[PDB]
Design a binder for this molecule. Structure first.
Ligand SMILES: Cc1cc2nc3c(=O)[nH]c(=O)nc-3n(C[C@H](O)[C@H](O)[C@H](O)COP(=O)(O)O)c2cc1C
Ligand SMILES: Cc1cc2nc3c(=O)[nH]c(=O)nc-3n(C[C@H](O)[C@H](O)[C@H](O)COP(=O)(O)O)c2cc1C
Lengths: 157, 156
């Protein structure tokens, strides 16, 4: 069928990394997890992800000047679920860095990308958010987590 | 450093699966490998990927009625490379099925997703292609290939 649960299950067979998208307002960290990160363009540098239109967190991020994207590492399985929590501290047991731009990054992750919204494209029950990348940090020693079939896996062979 | 080479390096640290996007035109299969597949919407059912604007294959696919997407499995490292090859038979070595709609699928993959173009969103040197899913089949729980840092990896 093309029902939401059946679609969700089928989509889950396609593996992908997971990001934290986060920023700080008045010293308070605001963020969410997304499995829909896409590296889009090199010139100019663009990325994208898809946000649920019903999100109550996204309205608190979308007007901020800069957002931090962190590609979660293979030990951040609990962190990924925690960043998705409806209630509770989404940054529990995490170490983070807040840049002067307000972008927030998670320490110990594979990649940090500082980003700014370029376009918002309505897409069914989500919105595709296209962002410009303004800064990059790579941590070569941290392999990434992979979200697949509802679970969090590490790369092997 | 925000040069193309620096971005390629950084972007390569993001792991993702690889899909075959394929169709048959006048008896000849046409396709490419993409690692930028993302699920977009459940209601209505939408997915997307990012296509290079300079692609010479995409113009052969973009006006077709229906495209086949197959998620590549861990045995398909060779298949992914071949489906990306700038010359030669991109389907060499593969078992495929072609539907009456023209959509083409790879046998031995976990999921077959049939779809048609919904929107084309310019995005720098790529275009984000939003597709409306018309049919989806889970064939079996075949473990996927993962593209990461220019290598084809399996899940541990
Ligand atoms: C592994 C995983 C991947 C997720 N991917 C997305 C996503 O790509 N887009 C999205 O809007 N929410 C995604 N979520 C949901 C959020 O992270 C979070 O649960 C949601 O934003 C919370 O509701 P709120 O924004 O109304 O506070 C994901 C959650 C998990 C656990
Ligand atoms: C693992 C892998 C992932 C790829 N992902 C994409 C992609 O997401 N988008 C894209 O336009 N090309 C992608 N390519 C490139 C194509 O598969 C192919 O090499 C290209 O379309 C060939 O050039 P042509 O379209 O001018 O024939 C990928 C190639 C490989 C090996």
């Amino acid at each position: 069928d093309l029902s939401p649960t059946s679609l969700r299950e089928a989509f889950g067979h396609f593996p992908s990394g997971v990001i934290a998208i986060a920023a700080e307002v008045d010293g308070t960290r605001v963020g969410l997890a997304a499995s829909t990160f896409v590296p889009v363009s090199l010139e100019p540098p663009l990325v994208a992800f898809a946000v649920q239109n019903s999100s109550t967190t996204w309205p608190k991020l979308k007007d901020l000047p800069s957002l931090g994207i962190s590609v979660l590492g293979e030990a951040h399985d609990t962190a990924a679920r925690t960043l998705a929590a409806k209630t509770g501290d989404r940054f529990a047991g995490l170490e983070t860095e807040s840049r002067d731009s307000g972008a927030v990054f998670i320490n110990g992750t594979s990649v940090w990308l500082e980003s700014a919204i370029e376009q918002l494209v309505p897409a069914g029950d989500h919105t595709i958010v296209v962002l410009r990348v303004s800064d990059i940090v790579i941590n070569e020693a941290v392999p990434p987590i992979v979200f697949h079939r509802s679970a969090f896996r590490k790369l092997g062979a």
